[PDB]
Ligand binder design. Structure first.
Ligand code: M77
Length: 340
């Protein structure tokens, strides 16, 4: 580790801790925005393209229903998500611009990234070439180096959470499972195909789960499908815990070697969790052509630029029923969300 990297990360941690200890709160309100379109929807919230009525800027507004967050046992997770997002700063992490709450909902107003999910692009082309997968993987490696140095675990890496920006670079979204952890944590969360064995087996786990998930992501980008696939989750879990993985013959030997070390079922032997930390990944032969500083500085020409007409274009996102944003006349769950 060059003193240069050490000093960068020391400053990053100082700046994160100052915002972590004194979080911003209540920095806009709903009637500052016009609603444009629903971009995504889930069991306790949705994301909406909105336009600020005074500046004209577009944003992605995540709206969480407090009562559904409580029912689905996501209180601490939603508090983690906002407290972390308002404190971080890195080129490949989506920016939180405003946050607020009302009688019914929590609101996180983020930069709008018009290029769409990596998932859509991957499914449309089939698979990414190794150089193309490597460009995205390098951004995730650097992002995890940053997050883990702050004692943060991400826990939701998957192609649907990685958006492609106007320059073709990644923006990581969805901090709903991110957590500040010194040592181990225990919650069962994440998407089946991406879960590390130690999550499935109900162990106290650490940042090594993010490095496992990177292995799954690289495999899926390069093959077009994930390494452990089945019709039902329990069948997926049996494959994950087995210690067996099959690689397409078109994978390079270097790619297969990196993946065996990320998809290592013994967490004490897994790349990213050894004495040399992230450098076992950054120095691997599969990354020999990667200029880490040039990626960080966004000086590498991207594999593709998404096609879109302007900052309000939604063509790279898909269509959802447009439902009301109702705000109750009575405050709900005020105590639970006091710190938001
Ligand atoms: O609309 S999003 O939730 C989304 C979340 C957070 C920030 C965003 C910024 N720009 C666009 C979409 C965004 N998104 C697409 C549909 C669902 N998959 C996850 C990514």
């Amino acid at each position: 580790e060059q003193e240069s990297v050490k000093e960068f990360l020391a400053k990053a941690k100082e700046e994160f801790l100052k915002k972590w200890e004194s979080p911003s709160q209540n920095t806009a309100q709903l009637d500052h925005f016009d609603r444009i379109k629903t971009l995504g929807t889930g069991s306790f919230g949705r994301v909406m393209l909105v336009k600020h009525k005074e500046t004209g800027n577009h944003y992605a507004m995540k709206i969480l229903d407090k009562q559904k967050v409580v029912k689905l046992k996501q209180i601490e997770h939603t508090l983690n998500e906002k407290r972390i997002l308002q404190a971080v700063n890195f080129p490949f992490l989506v920016k939180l611009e405003f946050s607020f709450k009302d009688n019914s909902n929590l609101y996180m107003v983020m930069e709008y990234v018009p290029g769409g999910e990596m998932f859509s692009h991957l499914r449309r082309i089939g698979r990414f070439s190794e150089p193309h997968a490597r460009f995205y993987a390098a951004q995730i490696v650097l992002t995890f180096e940053y997050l883990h140095s702050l004692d943060l675990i991400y826990r939701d890496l998957k192609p649907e959470n990685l958006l492609i920006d106007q320059q073709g670079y990644i923006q990581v979204t969805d901090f709903g499972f991110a957590k500040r952890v010194k040592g181990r944590t225990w919650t069962l969360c994440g998407t089946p195909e991406y879960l590390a064995p130690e999550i499935i087996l109900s162990k106290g786990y650490n940042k090594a789960v993010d490095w496992w998930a990177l292995g799954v992501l690289i495999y899926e980008m390069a093959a077009g499908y994930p390494p452990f696939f089945a019709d039902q989750p329990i069948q997926i879990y049996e494959k994950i815990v087995s210690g067996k993985v099959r690689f397409p013959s078109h994978f390079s030997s270097d790619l297969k070697d990196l993946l065996r070390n990320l998809l290592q079922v013994d967490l004490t032997k897994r790349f990213g969790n050894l004495k040399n930390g992230v450098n076992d990944i950054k120095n691997h032969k599969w990354f020999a052509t990667t200029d880490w500083i040039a990626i960080y500085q966004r000086k590498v020409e991207a594999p593709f630029i998404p096609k879109f007409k302007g900052p309000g274009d939604t063509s790279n996102f898909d269509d959802y029923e447009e439902e009301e944003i109702r705000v109750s006349i009575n405050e709900k769950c005020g105590k639970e969300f006091t710190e938001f």
